[PDB]
Amino acid sequence: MQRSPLEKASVVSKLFFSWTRPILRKGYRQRLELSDIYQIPSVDSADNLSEKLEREWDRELASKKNPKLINALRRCFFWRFMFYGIFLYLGEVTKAVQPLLLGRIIASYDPDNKEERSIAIYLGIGLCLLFIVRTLLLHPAIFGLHHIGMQMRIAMFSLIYKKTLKLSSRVLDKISIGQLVSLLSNNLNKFDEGLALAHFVWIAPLQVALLMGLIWELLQASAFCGLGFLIVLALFQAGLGRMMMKYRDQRAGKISERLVITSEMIENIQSVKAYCWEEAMEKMIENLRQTELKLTRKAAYVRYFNSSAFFFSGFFVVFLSVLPYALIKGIILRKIFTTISFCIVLRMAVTRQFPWAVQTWYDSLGAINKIQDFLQKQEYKTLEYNLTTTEVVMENVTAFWEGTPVLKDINFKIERGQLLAVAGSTGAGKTSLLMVIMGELEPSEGKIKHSGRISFCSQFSWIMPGTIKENIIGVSYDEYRYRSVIKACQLEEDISKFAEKDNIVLGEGGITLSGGQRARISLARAVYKDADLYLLDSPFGYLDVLTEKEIFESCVCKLMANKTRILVTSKMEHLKKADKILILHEGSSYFYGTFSELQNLWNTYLRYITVHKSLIFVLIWCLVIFLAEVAASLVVLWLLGSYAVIITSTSSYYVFYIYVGVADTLLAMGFFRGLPLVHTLITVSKILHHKMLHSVLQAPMSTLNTLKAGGILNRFSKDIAILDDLLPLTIFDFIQLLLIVIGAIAVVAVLQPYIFVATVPVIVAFIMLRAYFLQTSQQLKQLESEGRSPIFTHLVTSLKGLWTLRAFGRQPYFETLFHKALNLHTANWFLYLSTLRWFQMRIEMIFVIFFIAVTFISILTTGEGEGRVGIILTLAMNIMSTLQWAVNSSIDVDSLMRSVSRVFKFIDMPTEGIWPSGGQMTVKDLTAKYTEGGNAILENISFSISPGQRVGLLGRTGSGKSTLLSAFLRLLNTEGEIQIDGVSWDSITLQQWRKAFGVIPQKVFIFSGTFRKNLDPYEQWSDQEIWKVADEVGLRSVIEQFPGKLDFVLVDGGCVLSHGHKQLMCLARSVLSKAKILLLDQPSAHLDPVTYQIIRRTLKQAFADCTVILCEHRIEAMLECQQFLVIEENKVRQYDSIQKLLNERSLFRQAISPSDRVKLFP
Ligand SMILES: Cc1nn(C)cc1S(=O)(=O)NC(=O)c1ccc(-n2ccc(OCC(C)(C)C(F)(F)F)n2)nc1N1C[C@@H](C)CC1(C)C
Ligand SMILES: CC(C)(CO)c1cc2cc(NC(=O)C3(c4ccc5c(c4)OC(F)(F)O5)CC3)c(F)cc2n1C[C@@H](O)CO
Ligand SMILES: Nc1ncnc2c1ncn2[C@@H]1O[C@H](COP(=O)(O)OP(=O)(O)OP(=O)(O)O)[C@@H](O)[C@H]1O
Ligand SMILES: Nc1ncnc2c1ncn2[C@@H]1O[C@H](COP(=O)(O)OP(=O)(O)OP(=O)(O)O)[C@@H](O)[C@H]1O
Ligand SMILES: CC(C)(C)c1cc(C(C)(C)C)c(NC(=O)c2c[nH]c3ccccc3c2=O)cc1O
Ligand SMILES: CC(C)CCC[C@@H](C)[C@H]1CC[C@H]2[C@@H]3CC=C4C[C@@H](O)CC[C@]4(C)[C@H]3CC[C@]12C
Ligand SMILES: CCCCCCCCCCCC
Ligand SMILES: [Mg+2]
Ligand SMILES: [Mg+2]
């Protein structure tokens, strides 16, 4: 990693941006290697910028009664902002006085203008120095303003993230992931470049005042007829600005709603494929896209009229200011041309630079105001204590999640070292009681007293990205303690089977790990941490009886025999070792005491154009009208080769100069060509998104596991927004400029076939430099686009584990990890702007040297009369002033076309592509593996199932019970044959095979939507049928407690529901879509014994005969099975009776609960 070459560059080197030479010469030959990227300058590191802004923002909250974020920003950047403003202003004044020097030089070709001929050589020298000063004064000032805008964005992004970790739990309900992503993505590039346009709010009015005086000198009182037209045009554009912003505000809410739904369905794409819900998911996104595209089109029509206003004023402001003057007294051709030159600069300031500057202030101040509101939300109240009486106590505590209280009159007292066991039915408030103790649920009544040290283990196991060892140890590594908790948590057997022991890298969310393996990593993390109080929220959910027995008798009873701890349990064996017993029932304390007293009872462009058939026809239509206007202009112009206009023989060359000055209005695209072009370019974006979303759902699971959450969110938010807003109008601007250059050249090249010869050397010089620069610019843009992903990936994972983050105190670690993501994007983005500034500065210096040669050639060639060389050469250089604008606009088109190629890569991803009368199956030599180069988890598996019977799957956690179920649906690489009632595996299409199954996934899927929409996304059942099923699974009381019965919206993945309520929701789905063969993957994970009767009755009534393959861990669930399959060391054994199964195993028979042993062994 080399140091930045900017920090030791000489004064002249910084001026010409010469320090970018090493990378431009290397990127032209080879691909940019990882060592070519330089380190960022020390001034713009995220650590130093965040501290500077934080110091000023805290001064506002204490000094001023009315804090404003814009005052803190003003106190850090105002003087540098104004320093570059004055140099930018002097570069624009130089542009307005150019016609004073160039206008008199053009007059020296006329032999009548004897006064201009005597001093022509001095005007040429001054003109050359004027060009050089303007070049050296604009570009360094524009780069400095880009630098300031980058620093402001980095400082403010870090403040948002630091505030996020401190948000209260009540205000988290009102904030989704889609709001934060839209807040950051919209400003990721627009904010930096906005500061270069901000100064024209006061530069444009000063340019108008200067230019109006010079035009007054020529046309005494007729000049104001041109000002009255431009004032009316300025009011018109101001009105279109407010009309466009109204449509943009109505569109923001729908984009955030689409982003959250898109993120949810891709995170659990395996559950979507098992249910065969791809078509239903596409329909929901299609309806959201359609509503927001109508607002996008309406904003596009308004923005077209705002953009073409420049081209449609070039003739009507010149004509209106000259016509009253010519009618009273004849005007010569010399004055007509000079007025045209001054009006070009005037139209640019009024119709282009000023409305763009006003719009930037609306966007910038709007975002800073939006950020300030977020920075003032309610914060989490960390009620830490340094010390206590070493005992925990609650007194008459009542809490509300908002007409029923969650808890009421809950009181206990646990001394140091005692064990408290919390028990109760589903939804009784066991998890809420632990939230109250930690302080994430503030009680309305009562009080809490205990020490500030605490450790937590939730039902939902959160796995941070990184190594397994890094998950457990935290910050401080201890060799002795680490090896003890691993052995006590029974993780040694699983770790030894991994490719590289405990050094394997876990993805975000821990997808590659088993259901029960994640629970042990979460538990090992809690016991490794030293604390005074330990909270365990049902950690024995996805564990078999043998592993559960070993952990309970060696981890929580041996290692922590002297530490007070609270555990949630439903087993009656865990209640005997507890000193205190607490029973909960619907928020009220059912019992409190002890157990003893209880026992008393390029190809990219071509593909983009041809994706929509209607885009070709509009482009041909624009070409035919263009040829008709050029032909019309040629006939008129050829016809011209006291009066209102005075023209002489030696002054007739002004006709061509006037034509070139008004060609931008004769060739302007009217609304018959502008609106269809803009309308059709948005339909292309609609088609591309439909394909992109479609190909992601059909991709094979092996491909989808490589992608990251931030990688998908980068393409669906930033790349789609580019194709909707920026590209349609950038293309229109580029096409408009290209037509003007061709039309002006073609007309004058046939009437004077020497302008074309003299304009060749300038054209090829621009094209050769463009090809050289695009070799390296395209690679830096690609690296910058992919550098946004780590920013989005870290933002997603920090919200999913916010509660665990604050409990373990790892906030500083996550802030430092966020700054590395900011610095990685800064390196690529800063290097991209530097080379872009080099190109635009060289494209202007190349224009200058040619003009310097032309000016001196014309003056020396002009002899005693006329002088034709100068007339031709100076005309050609006037055309190249517009070609310079067209070349720079082509770079913007190419930069935005990088998003089109990134979308095309997601589209080209490979695809994975009464029969069951009885439902009997046959498996022959099935071999299953996740990666083709990985180990075979199962191998040579073979068994048969008779129709109507139930099969029980058994085995230790991590043995491969879920792998066998995934192999039936072909969710991984398989090498065998499965036969269902006669048909063959291979012959069937992959879509009819999956429809024969009913599935209950181990990980439940609830998306943001209505209760009825979650139970039935295809809308194929009436509400009478839905309620009938809802009674059989006991969900009626759950739905009625909400304001909308079957209408309530389940936001944030159904966070309103408890853990046991989600299991019943998945059982309802399987009953509704009644199929023959069922694959139930542990449907009673955390259900208490009383609630399990609901699963038991459903299994015998709803699934009358069927072919049920259970995958349960509880012994009670195996009394309803006729056949058994045991998975051990990658092999499947088969048994006919449960009593035979336990006879062979000696250790597993002892772990059986005595309550279950009597019925298992009568
Ligand atoms: C080497 C090198 N390679 N790369 C990638 C960067 C570098 S460089 O930064 O060292 N220099 C150059 O980049 C460089 C510097 C100046 C110029 N100039 C062109 C006209 C001109 O007159 C200046 C003028 C008299 C108008 C005045 F002074 F008045 F303005 N100067 N051209 C330069 N280029 C080198 C080639 C890459 C292509 C080319 C010809 C455009
Ligand atoms: C002196 C006085 C006339 C009033 O005492 C004044 C100065 C001033 C400066 C800024 N902003 C800036 O100096 C910066 C800036 C921020 C945001 C940007 C950006 C530049 O340019 C953008 F448009 F891109 O957005 C560099 C930080 C402002 F906002 C309002 C200001 N006012 C009016 C006053 O009422 C403000 O309280
Ligand atoms: N964020 C929330 N907003 C509103 N109600 C909630 C919220 N979280 C939980 N509830 C409700 O509070 C009650 C108790 O919550 P819950 O976590 O606490 O039960 P539990 O004892 O953990 O049961 P389980 O065995 O399913 O884990 C339920 O009726 C549940 O729907
Ligand atoms: N996507 C994956 N890629 C690679 N290995 C995986 C993947 N998913 C699981 N494994 C590994 O395969 C083995 C078996 O996985 P697992 O689902 O299949 O078993 P299980 O019997 O369902 O466990 P549990 O009772 O915890 O649910 C484990 O070692 C696990 O880490
Ligand atoms: C009738 C005919 C010849 C097809 C026609 C008509 C117009 C109107 C009537 C809208 C002026 C226009 N005008 C336009 O397209 C205009 C486009 N952009 C503008 C921007 C600012 C101010 C005016 C216009 C404008 O008139 C063009 C035409 O070709
Ligand atoms: C940037 C701004 C403040 C610069 C100064 C703006 C004003 C004061 C300048 C700009 C152009 C100037 C005019 C240019 C030409 C003439 C013609 C001359 O026969 C009388 C003075 C007169 C009419 C000038 C008056 C002052 C003037 C209107
Ligand atoms: C350099 C430009 C400073 C003034 C720009 C506008 C100031 C913000 C006004 C806020 C609303 C009254
Ligand atoms: Mg719970
Ligand atoms: Mg499993």
JSON list of C-alpha atoms in Angstrom, two decimals, residues 422-528:
[
{"chain": "A", "resi": 422, "resn": "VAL", "atom": "CA", "xyz": [-38.75, -19.51, 34.61]},
{"chain": "A", "resi": 423, "resn": "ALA", "atom": "CA", "xyz": [-41.56, -21.66, 33.20]},
{"chain": "A", "resi": 424, "resn": "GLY", "atom": "CA", "xyz": [-44.87, -21.12, 31.45]},
{"chain": "A", "resi": 425, "resn": "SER", "atom": "CA", "xyz": [-46.86, -21.68, 28.29]},
{"chain": "A", "resi": 426, "resn": "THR", "atom": "CA", "xyz": [-46.45, -20.06, 24.88]},
{"chain": "A", "resi": 427, "resn": "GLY", "atom": "CA", "xyz": [-46.78, -16.29, 24.94]},
{"chain": "A", "resi": 428, "resn": "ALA", "atom": "CA", "xyz": [-46.86, -16.13, 28.75]},
{"chain": "A", "resi": 429, "resn": "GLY", "atom": "CA", "xyz": [-44.15, -13.45, 28.87]},
{"chain": "A", "resi": 430, "resn": "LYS", "atom": "CA", "xyz": [-40.93, -15.37, 29.53]},
{"chain": "A", "resi": 431, "resn": "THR", "atom": "CA", "xyz": [-38.82, -13.50, 26.95]},
{"chain": "A", "resi": 432, "resn": "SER", "atom": "CA", "xyz": [-40.37, -10.16, 27.91]},
{"chain": "A", "resi": 433, "resn": "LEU", "atom": "CA", "xyz": [-39.29, -10.68, 31.53]},
{"chain": "A", "resi": 434, "resn": "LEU", "atom": "CA", "xyz": [-35.66, -10.94, 30.39]},
{"chain": "A", "resi": 435, "resn": "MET", "atom": "CA", "xyz": [-36.02, -7.80, 28.27]},
{"chain": "A", "resi": 436, "resn": "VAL", "atom": "CA", "xyz": [-37.19, -5.88, 31.35]},
{"chain": "A", "resi": 437, "resn": "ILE", "atom": "CA", "xyz": [-34.16, -6.94, 33.41]},
{"chain": "A", "resi": 438, "resn": "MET", "atom": "CA", "xyz": [-31.68, -5.82, 30.76]},
{"chain": "A", "resi": 439, "resn": "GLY", "atom": "CA", "xyz": [-33.44, -2.48, 30.36]},
{"chain": "A", "resi": 440, "resn": "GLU", "atom": "CA", "xyz": [-34.71, -2.70, 26.78]},
{"chain": "A", "resi": 441, "resn": "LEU", "atom": "CA", "xyz": [-38.31, -2.64, 28.09]},
{"chain": "A", "resi": 442, "resn": "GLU", "atom": "CA", "xyz": [-38.89, 0.21, 30.52]},
{"chain": "A", "resi": 443, "resn": "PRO", "atom": "CA", "xyz": [-41.48, -0.69, 33.19]},
{"chain": "A", "resi": 444, "resn": "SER", "atom": "CA", "xyz": [-44.33, 1.75, 33.78]},
{"chain": "A", "resi": 445, "resn": "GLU", "atom": "CA", "xyz": [-44.51, 0.66, 37.44]},
{"chain": "A", "resi": 446, "resn": "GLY", "atom": "CA", "xyz": [-42.13, -0.98, 39.90]},
{"chain": "A", "resi": 447, "resn": "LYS", "atom": "CA", "xyz": [-38.37, -1.00, 40.19]},
{"chain": "A", "resi": 448, "resn": "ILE", "atom": "CA", "xyz": [-35.29, -3.07, 39.32]},
{"chain": "A", "resi": 449, "resn": "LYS", "atom": "CA", "xyz": [-32.14, -3.46, 41.42]},
{"chain": "A", "resi": 450, "resn": "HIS", "atom": "CA", "xyz": [-28.99, -5.38, 40.47]},
{"chain": "A", "resi": 451, "resn": "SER", "atom": "CA", "xyz": [-25.42, -4.83, 39.35]},
{"chain": "A", "resi": 452, "resn": "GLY", "atom": "CA", "xyz": [-24.60, -3.53, 35.88]},
{"chain": "A", "resi": 453, "resn": "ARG", "atom": "CA", "xyz": [-22.74, -6.63, 34.66]},
{"chain": "A", "resi": 454, "resn": "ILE", "atom": "CA", "xyz": [-24.93, -8.96, 32.59]},
{"chain": "A", "resi": 455, "resn": "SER", "atom": "CA", "xyz": [-24.71, -11.65, 29.91]},
{"chain": "A", "resi": 456, "resn": "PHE", "atom": "CA", "xyz": [-27.41, -12.56, 27.41]},
{"chain": "A", "resi": 457, "resn": "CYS", "atom": "CA", "xyz": [-28.42, -15.47, 25.17]},
{"chain": "A", "resi": 458, "resn": "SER", "atom": "CA", "xyz": [-31.59, -14.96, 23.11]},
{"chain": "A", "resi": 459, "resn": "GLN", "atom": "CA", "xyz": [-33.86, -17.44, 21.34]},
{"chain": "A", "resi": 460, "resn": "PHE", "atom": "CA", "xyz": [-32.84, -15.98, 17.96]},
{"chain": "A", "resi": 461, "resn": "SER", "atom": "CA", "xyz": [-29.17, -16.89, 17.53]},
{"chain": "A", "resi": 462, "resn": "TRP", "atom": "CA", "xyz": [-27.22, -14.07, 15.88]},
{"chain": "A", "resi": 463, "resn": "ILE", "atom": "CA", "xyz": [-23.96, -14.92, 14.09]},
{"chain": "A", "resi": 464, "resn": "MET", "atom": "CA", "xyz": [-21.62, -12.08, 13.17]},
{"chain": "A", "resi": 465, "resn": "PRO", "atom": "CA", "xyz": [-19.36, -12.46, 10.11]},
{"chain": "A", "resi": 466, "resn": "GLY", "atom": "CA", "xyz": [-15.91, -13.85, 10.81]},
{"chain": "A", "resi": 467, "resn": "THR", "atom": "CA", "xyz": [-14.23, -16.86, 12.34]},
{"chain": "A", "resi": 468, "resn": "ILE", "atom": "CA", "xyz": [-15.94, -19.17, 14.84]},
{"chain": "A", "resi": 469, "resn": "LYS", "atom": "CA", "xyz": [-13.24, -18.36, 17.40]},
{"chain": "A", "resi": 470, "resn": "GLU", "atom": "CA", "xyz": [-13.71, -14.61, 16.87]},
{"chain": "A", "resi": 471, "resn": "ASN", "atom": "CA", "xyz": [-17.42, -15.02, 17.65]},
{"chain": "A", "resi": 472, "resn": "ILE", "atom": "CA", "xyz": [-16.80, -16.56, 21.07]},
{"chain": "A", "resi": 473, "resn": "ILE", "atom": "CA", "xyz": [-13.69, -14.89, 22.50]},
{"chain": "A", "resi": 474, "resn": "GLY", "atom": "CA", "xyz": [-14.78, -11.29, 21.91]},
{"chain": "A", "resi": 475, "resn": "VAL", "atom": "CA", "xyz": [-11.86, -8.90, 22.29]},
{"chain": "A", "resi": 476, "resn": "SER", "atom": "CA", "xyz": [-9.63, -10.61, 24.86]},
{"chain": "A", "resi": 477, "resn": "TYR", "atom": "CA", "xyz": [-8.27, -14.08, 24.12]},
{"chain": "A", "resi": 478, "resn": "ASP", "atom": "CA", "xyz": [-7.55, -16.54, 26.95]},
{"chain": "A", "resi": 479, "resn": "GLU", "atom": "CA", "xyz": [-6.13, -19.94, 26.02]},
{"chain": "A", "resi": 480, "resn": "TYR", "atom": "CA", "xyz": [-7.27, -21.70, 29.21]},
{"chain": "A", "resi": 481, "resn": "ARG", "atom": "CA", "xyz": [-10.85, -20.40, 29.33]},
{"chain": "A", "resi": 482, "resn": "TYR", "atom": "CA", "xyz": [-11.45, -20.83, 25.59]},
{"chain": "A", "resi": 483, "resn": "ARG", "atom": "CA", "xyz": [-10.53, -24.53, 25.65]},
{"chain": "A", "resi": 484, "resn": "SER", "atom": "CA", "xyz": [-12.79, -25.17, 28.66]},
{"chain": "A", "resi": 485, "resn": "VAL", "atom": "CA", "xyz": [-16.03, -23.67, 27.32]},
{"chain": "A", "resi": 486, "resn": "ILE", "atom": "CA", "xyz": [-15.55, -25.46, 23.98]},
{"chain": "A", "resi": 487, "resn": "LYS", "atom": "CA", "xyz": [-15.34, -28.84, 25.73]},
{"chain": "A", "resi": 488, "resn": "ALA", "atom": "CA", "xyz": [-18.28, -28.08, 28.03]},
{"chain": "A", "resi": 489, "resn": "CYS", "atom": "CA", "xyz": [-20.48, -26.95, 25.12]},
{"chain": "A", "resi": 490, "resn": "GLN", "atom": "CA", "xyz": [-19.93, -30.21, 23.16]},
{"chain": "A", "resi": 491, "resn": "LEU", "atom": "CA", "xyz": [-18.50, -28.25, 20.20]},
{"chain": "A", "resi": 492, "resn": "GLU", "atom": "CA", "xyz": [-15.34, -30.38, 19.88]},
{"chain": "A", "resi": 493, "resn": "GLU", "atom": "CA", "xyz": [-17.02, -33.14, 17.85]},
{"chain": "A", "resi": 494, "resn": "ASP", "atom": "CA", "xyz": [-18.48, -30.73, 15.29]},
{"chain": "A", "resi": 495, "resn": "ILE", "atom": "CA", "xyz": [-15.35, -28.57, 14.97]},
{"chain": "A", "resi": 496, "resn": "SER", "atom": "CA", "xyz": [-13.13, -31.56, 14.14]},
{"chain": "A", "resi": 497, "resn": "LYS", "atom": "CA", "xyz": [-15.23, -32.38, 11.06]},
{"chain": "A", "resi": 498, "resn": "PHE", "atom": "CA", "xyz": [-14.76, -28.94, 9.47]},
{"chain": "A", "resi": 499, "resn": "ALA", "atom": "CA", "xyz": [-12.21, -28.40, 6.71]},
{"chain": "A", "resi": 500, "resn": "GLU", "atom": "CA", "xyz": [-9.90, -26.22, 8.84]},
{"chain": "A", "resi": 501, "resn": "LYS", "atom": "CA", "xyz": [-11.14, -26.84, 12.39]},
{"chain": "A", "resi": 502, "resn": "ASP", "atom": "CA", "xyz": [-12.39, -23.64, 14.04]},
{"chain": "A", "resi": 503, "resn": "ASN", "atom": "CA", "xyz": [-10.79, -21.25, 11.52]},
{"chain": "A", "resi": 504, "resn": "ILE", "atom": "CA", "xyz": [-13.59, -21.60, 8.94]},
{"chain": "A", "resi": 505, "resn": "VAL", "atom": "CA", "xyz": [-15.11, -18.28, 7.89]},
{"chain": "A", "resi": 506, "resn": "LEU", "atom": "CA", "xyz": [-18.80, -17.84, 8.69]},
{"chain": "A", "resi": 507, "resn": "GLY", "atom": "CA", "xyz": [-21.02, -15.82, 6.40]},
{"chain": "A", "resi": 508, "resn": "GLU", "atom": "CA", "xyz": [-23.34, -13.08, 7.59]},
{"chain": "A", "resi": 509, "resn": "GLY", "atom": "CA", "xyz": [-26.13, -14.94, 9.39]},
{"chain": "A", "resi": 510, "resn": "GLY", "atom": "CA", "xyz": [-24.31, -18.26, 9.76]},
{"chain": "A", "resi": 511, "resn": "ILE", "atom": "CA", "xyz": [-26.04, -19.97, 6.83]},
{"chain": "A", "resi": 512, "resn": "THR", "atom": "CA", "xyz": [-23.40, -22.67, 6.42]},
{"chain": "A", "resi": 513, "resn": "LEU", "atom": "CA", "xyz": [-23.91, -23.90, 10.01]},
{"chain": "A", "resi": 514, "resn": "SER", "atom": "CA", "xyz": [-26.58, -26.25, 11.33]},
{"chain": "A", "resi": 515, "resn": "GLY", "atom": "CA", "xyz": [-29.60, -25.20, 13.35]},
{"chain": "A", "resi": 516, "resn": "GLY", "atom": "CA", "xyz": [-28.26, -26.62, 16.60]},
{"chain": "A", "resi": 517, "resn": "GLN", "atom": "CA", "xyz": [-24.65, -25.61, 15.95]},
{"chain": "A", "resi": 518, "resn": "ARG", "atom": "CA", "xyz": [-25.62, -21.92, 15.94]},
{"chain": "A", "resi": 519, "resn": "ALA", "atom": "CA", "xyz": [-27.32, -22.33, 19.32]},
{"chain": "A", "resi": 520, "resn": "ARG", "atom": "CA", "xyz": [-24.13, -23.72, 20.87]},
{"chain": "A", "resi": 521, "resn": "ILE", "atom": "CA", "xyz": [-21.99, -20.91, 19.45]},
{"chain": "A", "resi": 522, "resn": "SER", "atom": "CA", "xyz": [-24.41, -18.39, 20.95]},
{"chain": "A", "resi": 523, "resn": "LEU", "atom": "CA", "xyz": [-24.36, -20.20, 24.30]},
{"chain": "A", "resi": 524, "resn": "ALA", "atom": "CA", "xyz": [-20.57, -20.56, 24.29]},
{"chain": "A", "resi": 525, "resn": "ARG", "atom": "CA", "xyz": [-20.30, -16.80, 23.70]},
{"chain": "A", "resi": 526, "resn": "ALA", "atom": "CA", "xyz": [-22.46, -16.06, 26.75]},
{"chain": "A", "resi": 527, "resn": "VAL", "atom": "CA", "xyz": [-20.63, -18.34, 29.19]},
{"chain": "A", "resi": 528, "resn": "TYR", "atom": "CA", "xyz": [-17.19, -17.22, 27.99]}
]
